[PDB]
Amino acid sequence: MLSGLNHLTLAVSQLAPSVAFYQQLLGMTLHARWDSGAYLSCGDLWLCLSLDPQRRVTPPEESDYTHYAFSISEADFASFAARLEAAGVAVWKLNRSEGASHYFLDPDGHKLELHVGSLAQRLAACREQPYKGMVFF
Amino acid sequence: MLSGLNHLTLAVSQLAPSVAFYQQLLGMTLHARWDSGAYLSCGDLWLCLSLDPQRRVTPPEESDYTHYAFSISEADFASFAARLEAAGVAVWKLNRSEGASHYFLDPDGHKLELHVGSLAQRLAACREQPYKGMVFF
Ligand SMILES: [Mn+2]
Ligand SMILES: [Mn+2]
C-alpha cells in the first residue's frame, strides 16, 4: 500500500543557482549539499535537487503541463506572488483555472505553482461549476 | 511561507490508461474525472492527471532524472514490486544504493520510484558515509 509522496527529485543544470532559488527565494530549508546534489525540505516535502547534464531548458510553450504546486496560506499568497514578480521570476500559463494560483518557472524551466486550498475545497468548488464531463466518486 | 506540496500534476497522453495505472494498478483513490483530467489521492498526496496533446510517450533514455517517489513500508515493498513486474511495468534504473528503491515507469514515461525510508534516515546514513563534497547545515 502506497502512503503518499516520499520525495520529489528535480534534475537541474547548475546546482548553485537552483539551491539559491529554492532556499533563498522560496524559503525552503537546506539540509545538505554535495558536489552533485542537495536535500531540502518544505514542511513534510523532501525535495532533492540532482545535477543532471541532460537537463534542457525548454520554453514553457513547448513543454507539457506537468507541474508542482506548493501550499501557501490565504494571508501570504498575494505578497509572496508579488515578491516573485519583483525578483523577475518568469511565468507560464495553464489551460484551465484551478482556483487561487500563481504560476512560475524555476531556473531550469520546471513548472511551479503557489496554490491556496485543499483537494476537498477544490472538489467543492468543482461541484458548483464543474469541468466538462465531470463525474464525482 | 510555503507549507508543503499542494498537488502534483502529471501530463498524460491518454486518460484511460493512466487512470487504470494509478487507480487500479497502484491503488490510488479516484475522486473525480472529466473530459481532460482526473483527481486522485494517495495518502496526503493530491495527484492530478491532465490530458495534454503536447505529452509524448517518452523513453527513459530521452528524459532527465526528474522523478517522483512514493512511500511504502519495507514489509509491503517486495510484493508491490512483484505486482508491477507481473503487469509488465518497465524498470528504468537498478537500485545500486543501500536501502529499498524500485524504479519504474508510468504509461507516458514519467519516472516513478517506490522508496522505504525518510529524509532523517537518509541524512543519518550520509553523516556516516558522506557523498563527495558534502556539507551539512
Ligand atoms: Mn496546479
Ligand atoms: Mn529518488
Short mmCIF file of C-alpha atoms and ligand atoms in Angstrom, two decimals, chain A residues 67 69 94 96 98 101 103 113, chain B residues 7 9, ligand 1:
data_model
loop_
_atom_site.label_atom_id
_atom_site.label_comp_id
_atom_site.label_asym_id
_atom_site.label_seq_id
_atom_site.Cartn_x
_atom_site.Cartn_y
_atom_site.Cartn_z
CA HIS A 67 3.86 20.90 -12.69
CA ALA A 69 2.26 23.18 -6.65
CA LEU A 94 -2.11 26.64 -17.71
CA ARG A 96 -7.73 25.93 -17.26
CA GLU A 98 -7.98 25.69 -10.76
CA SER A 101 -2.90 30.03 -8.05
CA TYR A 103 2.29 30.02 -11.92
CA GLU A 113 2.72 26.93 -8.71
CA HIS B 7 -0.52 18.87 -5.59
CA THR B 9 0.17 17.29 -11.80
MN MN C 1 -1.86 23.08 -10.49
#
